[PDB]
Amino acid sequence: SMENFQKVEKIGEGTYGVVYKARNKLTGEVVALKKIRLDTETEGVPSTAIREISLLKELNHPNIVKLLDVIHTENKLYLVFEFLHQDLKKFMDASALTGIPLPLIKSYLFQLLQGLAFCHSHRVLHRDLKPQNLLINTEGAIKLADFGLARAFGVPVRTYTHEVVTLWYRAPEILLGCKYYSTAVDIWSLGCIFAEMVTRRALFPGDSEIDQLFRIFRTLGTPDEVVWPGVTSMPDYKPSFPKWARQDFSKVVPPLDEDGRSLLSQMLHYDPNKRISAKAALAHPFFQDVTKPVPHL
Amino acid sequence: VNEVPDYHEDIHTYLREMEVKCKPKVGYMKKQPDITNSMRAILVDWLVEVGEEYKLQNETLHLAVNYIDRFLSSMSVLRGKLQLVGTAAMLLASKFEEIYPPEVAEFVYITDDTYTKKQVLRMEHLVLKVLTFDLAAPTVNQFLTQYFLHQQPANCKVESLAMFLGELSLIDADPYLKYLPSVIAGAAFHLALYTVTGQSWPESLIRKTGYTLESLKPCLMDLHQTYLKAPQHAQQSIREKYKNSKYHGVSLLNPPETLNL
Numbered sequence: 001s002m003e004n005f006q007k008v009e010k011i012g013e014g015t016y017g018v019v020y021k022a023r024n025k026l027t028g029e030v031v032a033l034k035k036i037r038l039d040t041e042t043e044g045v046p047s048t049a050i051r052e053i054s055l056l057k058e059l060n061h062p063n064i065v066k067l068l069d070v071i072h073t074e075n076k077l078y079l080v081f082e083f084l085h086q087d088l089k090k091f092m093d094a095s096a097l098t099g100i101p102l103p104l105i106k107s108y109l110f111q112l113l114q115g116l117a118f119c120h121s122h123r124v125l126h127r128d129l130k131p132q133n134l135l136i137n138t139e140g141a142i143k144l145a146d147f148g149l150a151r152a153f154g155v156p157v158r159t160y161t162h163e164v165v166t167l168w169y170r171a172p173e174i175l176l177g178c179k180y181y182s183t184a185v186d187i188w189s190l191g192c193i194f195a196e197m198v199t200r201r202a203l204f205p206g207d208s209e210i211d212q213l214f215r216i217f218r219t220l221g222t223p224d225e226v227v228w229p230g231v232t233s234m235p236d237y238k239p240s241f242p243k244w245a246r247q248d249f250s251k252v253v254p255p256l257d258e259d260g261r262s263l264l265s266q267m268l269h270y271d272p273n274k275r276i277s278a279k280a281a282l283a284h285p286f287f288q289d290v291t292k293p294v295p296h297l
Numbered sequence: 298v299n300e301v302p303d304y305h306e307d308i309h310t311y312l313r314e315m316e317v318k319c320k321p322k323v324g325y326m327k328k329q330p331d332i333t334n335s336m337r338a339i340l341v342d343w344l345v346e347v348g349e350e351y352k353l354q355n356e357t358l359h360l361a362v363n364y365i366d367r368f369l370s371s372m373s374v375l376r377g378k379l380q381l382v383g384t385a386a387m388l389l390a391s392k393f394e395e396i397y398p399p400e401v402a403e404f405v406y407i408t409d410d411t412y413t414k415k416q417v418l419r420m421e422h423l424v425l426k427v428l429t430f431d432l433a434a435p436t437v438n439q440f441l442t443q444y445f446l447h448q449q450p451a452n453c454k455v456e457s458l459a460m461f462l463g464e465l466s467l468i469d470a471d472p473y474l475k476y477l478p479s480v481i482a483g484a485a486f487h488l489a490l491y492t493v494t495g496q497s498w499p500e501s502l503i504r505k506t507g508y509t510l511e512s513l514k515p516c517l518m519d520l521h522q523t524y525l526k527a528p529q530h531a532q533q534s535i536r537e538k539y540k541n542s543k544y545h546g547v548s549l550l551n552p553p554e555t556l557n558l
């Protein structure tokens with residue numbers, strides 16, 4: 001089927017492989033590709049692509065990118081997705097001066113929570129939530145993308161890969177080297193993005209693991225046994241960590257209302273056992289007046 | 298919360314659906330000209346040896362067996378190539394489930410250079426095409442790990458013996474292809490519970506799954522016969538694997554003479 005496509009341009013590079021904007025010559029459908037130069041005398045089909053395809057064939061949801069076809073030749077591999085108009089990071093950059101209106105931020109967060117709740121209800125961890133992987137269209141919708149780092153988990157989870165999350169959106173339990181990690185990490189990511197949507201700048205733009213930890217501490221206070229039981233026993237925990245006091249969120253996220261501050265506090269909770277679930281977050285009072293405004297690229 | 302409860306139910310329900318779609322054809326071995334159930338049992342025993350050799354997860358072995366069964370349901374394969382299939386599947390599951398999957402060279406090595414790296418990669422390609430990339434299949438292990446949470450005070454021996462029986466069910470295509478993974482998991486759990494503690498399939502699991510002891514009875518009978526005949530079975534790698542203290546050596550426990558069902 002791969003002679004049936006006109007490459008229009010290169011969009012960017014994702015978790016793995018190159019992404020092109022292309023058009024179907026027979027149906028006119030505009031789609032996005034994902035090209036993976038496979039190889040021979042190598043490891044073959046990468047695990048990222050395997051996981052992405054296998055999991056996206058199961059995840060049919062309005063707020064999750066629809067995978068239309070997989071064109072599987074012996075030399076290369078092509079994934080075909082619905083084409084979305086923009087990613088969240090360019091939209092933030094274009095809005096770094098005017099800002100995203102509160103109704104639009106609320107609608108985007110609501111949709112993201114719906115998608116993540118679907119993913120978690122289908123035993124899938126995304127593990128790479130960030131603005132580059134959040135795509136928007138001209139009709140006000142937003143979708144989760146690029147499950148290359150995603151993986152299907154099981155009931156009581158076992159030890160998974162540790163070197164998994166974009167640094168700025170990595171949950172504290174990962175930075176501290178906890179043995180078991182779960183849905184909570186994804187929630188954490190959205191939290192950061194939520195803040196990054198209001199302030200229009202990264203909440204915890206760390207340049208190293210320790211810097212990320214220290215920024216999280218300076219913003220939310222250095223965790224102890226009270227707020228997070230067991231923190232002192234984790235492998236990468238140090239009692240020599242500086243003890244910062246918790247900042248009132250009224251200073252962390254100024255433009256946010258009382259309900260929004262409550263939701264953000266529940267999303268950035270230290271104890272993953274305590275952190276709000278996406279399903280529970282959908283019922284927060286913050287979303288009682290939810291709408292679906294238009295972004296206007 | 299590491300036993301994620303807020304989405305707990307949904308996941309189970311979803312698996313109960315998915316296990317129906319990934320089911321291979323029950324009588325596919327009857328349509329295969331060159332292979333038999335015994336050859337498949339030898340392949341699965343070798344896969345157990347491989348998983349223990351590279352210290353792979355049990356879920357990986359279960360996924361590999363599921364892939365092999367689903368592939369052989371629609372593709373006729375000669376015996377001289379059977380291992381290749383069983384290799385590629387074991388590779389794919391390793392890429393899907395394992396953090397550090399063994400590299401292709403190691404899989405070629407464990408075949409004793411029976412096949413080439415090119416052959417293994419091309420068989421991986423073919424298996425992916427045949428299975429339409431539906432590799433996230435529910436396993437007996439995935440249901441066992443959920444059934445374990447309903448234990449009145451948990452027992453290491455019960456868990457190890459249930460996992461042992463679940464792995465044993467993989468060897469014999471006849472008759473264990475008749476039963477769904479959830480049913481096999483329930484039967485193994487009840488058998489281990491009755492063997493160690495004498496307790497029965499708990500009410501909480503009846504409410505959760507909808508399976509009753511009467512419904513599990515046929516799988517219980519088949520699995521009990523398999524458990525009783527295990528020492529005499531031609532394939533023994535699972536018993537050797539479960540001799541170790543890692544599974545508390547539950548393989549050498551005395552099975553009950555009757556189930557009083």
Ligand SMILES: N#CCNS(=O)(=O)c1ccc(Nc2ncc(Br)c(Nc3cccc(F)c3C(N)=O)n2)cc1
Nearest residue numbers: 012014019032081083084085086087090133145146
């Ligand atoms: N210039 C500029 C900066 N990029 S952008 O904001 O203009 C813009 C980015 C993406 C799209 N469309 C689109 N539709 C479906 C998919 Br699938 C998809 N994939 C990706 C594309 C690029 C990078 C990625 F990481 C992915 C990914 N995560 O897979 N992209 C449109 C505009």
